[model samples]
Target: MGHHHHHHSHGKSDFIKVNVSNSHNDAVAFEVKLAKDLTVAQLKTKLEILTGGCAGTMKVQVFKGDTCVSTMDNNDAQLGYYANSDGLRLHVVDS
Candidate 1:
C-alpha cells in the first residue's frame, strides 16, 4: 500500500496589491510588502512595488529578521499595517 500525504494551503498569498514610494526618487530606492505575512520575502515584494520607478537603478535589498514570526490565528487576529491610509495622498508634480 502507498501512503498519501497532503499539506494545508493557508491561502495567505492573496494580497490586496498596492504601490509604495519614498521621499527621494534618485537615492535610497526601497520597497515594502503590505502582506499580513511578516516574512521578509513579503517585505521584498513591498520594496519592489515602491521602487518600480527606479528599476534601472540596480539596487539590491536585504530582508532580514532576528527570528521567524508565526502567522496569526484564524477567526481571531491582531491587525496592523494591513491598511496604509486613506488620508495619505500622493501629489505628483513634474519638475
Candidate 2:
C-alpha cells in the first residue's frame, strides 16, 4: 500500500515598498498610488491593459532620476511620471 501527498505553491512575494509622495516641486503631485512588486509585464497583465489582449500604442513617460525624461519602453526602468503633449509610447510585441 502507498499514500499520495499534495503540494501547493505560495509563490514569490509581491509586496512593493512605495513612498506616497511627489518628487516634483508641487507643480505635479498625485493623490495616491498603489505600488506592487511586479514588473511592467506583470503590471500590465494585472491592470487595465490586458482587456485589449495586448499593450497598445499607449502614451507613457519616464523620469531621469530627479529630473524628468523620455523613454520608449514600459519596463520598470521608466518611472512613469506624465505623458507630454507629444510623448513617447511603449508596448509588448510578444509575450
Candidate 3:
C-alpha cells in the first residue's frame, strides 16, 4: 500500500548530524546525518558520494568545534564509541 503509517520505535539519539570537509577544499561542503551505530568504514563510503573521497586511501579526522578529538585509520571502529554529539566535524583526507 502506498499509504503507510509510520511507527516510532527508536530513540532520537540513534542519529546525528555531522559536517564534513574534503581535502580538495574546492567542492561544496557536505552535511551528513548518520546513524550513531555506523562504523568509520561505512562513513567513508558515504563521504565518497558527498565529497568525492575514495575509500581505498581515505583517512578520517574527527573534531568537536575547534578541538581535534582523534584521527583514525581502522575502519572497524564505530562512530558512537567516541561519544560524538551533533555539530561534529569530520575531515576527509585522501592520500
Give the winner by lDDT. 3
TM-score for each candidate, following the candidate numbering: 0.26, 0.28, 0.72
Taking the tens digit of each residue's C-alpha lDDT, what string does model 3 give over 1-95?
66778767665658777777777656656566788788887777877777676778777788777788878666688887664677778777878
Global lDDT scores for all candidate models: 0.34, 0.36, 0.75
Over 4 Å off, model 1? 1-10, 26-33, 39-95
Q: List the residue pairs that clash in candidate 1.
A: 31-47, 32-46, 32-47, 33-46
Error of 2 at 94 (Å): 18
The full ranking of all candidates by lDDT, starting with the best, is 3, 2, 1
- Residue 24 Cα positional deviation in candidate 2, in Å, after optimal superposition: 23
Which of the two, 1 or 3, has more TM-score? 3
Ranking 1 against 3 by lDDT, winner: 3
Q: Write the residue-wise lDDT of candidate 1 on 4-65 in tens digits.
A: 86668765653433333344454342232344434433443444455453333323221124
RMSD of 2: 13.7
Judging by TM-score, tell me the better candidate of 1 and 2. 2
Error of 1 at 94 (Å): 20
